[PDB]
Amino acid sequence: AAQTNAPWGLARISSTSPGTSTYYYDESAGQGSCVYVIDTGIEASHPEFEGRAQMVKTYYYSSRDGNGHGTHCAGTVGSRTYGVAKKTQLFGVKVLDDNGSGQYSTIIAGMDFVASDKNNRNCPKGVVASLSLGGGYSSSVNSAAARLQSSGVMVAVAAGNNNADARNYSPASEPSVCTVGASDRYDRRSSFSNYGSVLDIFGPGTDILSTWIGGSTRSISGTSMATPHVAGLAAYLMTLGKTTAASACRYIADTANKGDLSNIPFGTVNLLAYNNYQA
Ligand SMILES: [Ca+2]
Ligand SMILES: [Ca+2]
């Protein structure tokens, strides 16, 4: 399949080179996989989700995404026009309030919730969780992300927008999950992206167009936007049978575009998520 005039990030993850405009992908598109978006919620009624999104848990008064961030990230995972894995099922877990903020204890609860809830869902191609969130280092946040990964979920987490070493941020610094830095359309590390030895991979993160609340769309930037490219890619590759939840991060690093990024500090991987799609 080919989506013409796709958002630059979708085009980038299906090209060895920057500057293309078509997103090339296998039509299986993540069908049969499930991605939990642990965030501000998902506006599941957005036409871009085609019925494939639903809220499954909220830690606040409503399950409505009053913010947009979670709807944006969910759209990069799996919306029709803006998503990597256009046929995945999306499950929203609202751990962040409508200002985009959330307590670590609630974030941890949402991770534990996903580890259990997946056992009640039919996700034959496997389960991913996208965590476009984070704050300062917390061993209990890292342990919760480690547990979620150990339970059989491919966990992708933002590296953080601090232009600093991700070792000081969580869940970014948990080694066992997939920590995702951000790049821009010219293959530079995004100016805000964290870096460091714990990063596993970069994905498109600057000026990413996706779904927003109110049935709308908008373009925002962050490691939050790069993370769902990787989560969506994992779901896509799991549906293809090329990898598993336990091995998807390593597989994505294995198969990434290597050495294409600029302003990568020595000791940070120079790896950009790539679907290796060949028609
Ligand atoms: Ca290249
Ligand atoms: Ca890792």
Curated annotation (Swiss-Prot):
One GO molecular-function entry: serine-type endopeptidase activity
Boundaries of every Peptidase S8 domain copy: 7-279
GO cellular component: extracellular region
Names of required cofactors: Ca(2+)
Record keywords: Calcium, Disulfide bond, Hydrolase, Metal-binding, Protease, Serine protease, Signal, Zymogen
Disulfide bridges in this chain: C34-C123, C178-C249
Gene Ontology biological-process entries: proteolysis
Cofactor note: Binds 2 calcium ions per subunit.
Superkingdom of source: Eukaryota
Functional note: Hydrolyzes keratin at aromatic and hydrophobic residues.
Family as reported in the entry's similarity comment: Belongs to the peptidase S8 family.
Name of this chain's protein: Proteinase K
Species of provenance: Parengyodontium album (Tritirachium album)
Gene: PROK
